[PDB]
């Protein structure tokens, strides 16, 4: 335990920027792909919404991480908004 799960909705209409300011690493463990937050721009929108390095992305737009692919993801993050299910440590 120690980990908490919460939903995040981020919208591009808040910033002059067209990007959210974070990076993800993708890795396959025992046939299943997991997504982790690699870095978060301190001044970016993702940081503003509480995303942190080391967080795990469980879902994007209600789709499990292992069921996403790259073209699907590039599409979702170029849209005006996107929803995330994130597993994180408090603080």
């Amino acid at each position: 335990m120690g980990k908490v799960t919460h939903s995040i909705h981020i919208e591009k209409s808040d910033t002059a920027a067209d990007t959210y300011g974070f990076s993800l690493s993708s890795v396959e463990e025992d046939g299943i792909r997991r997504l982790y937050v690699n870095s978060v721009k301190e001044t970016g929108l993702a940081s503003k919404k509480g995303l942190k390095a080391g967080d795990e992305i469980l879902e994007i737009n209600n789709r499990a991480a292992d069921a996403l692919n790259s073209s699907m993801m590039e599409d979702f993050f170029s849209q005006p908004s996107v929803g995330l299910l994130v597993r994180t440590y408090p603080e």
Binding site: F22, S23, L24, S25, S26, S70, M73
Partner: peptide, 7 residues
């Protein structure tokens, strides 16, 4: 199959 994405 370690990929990385920037968003």
């Amino acid at each position: 199959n370690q990929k990385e994405y920037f968003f």
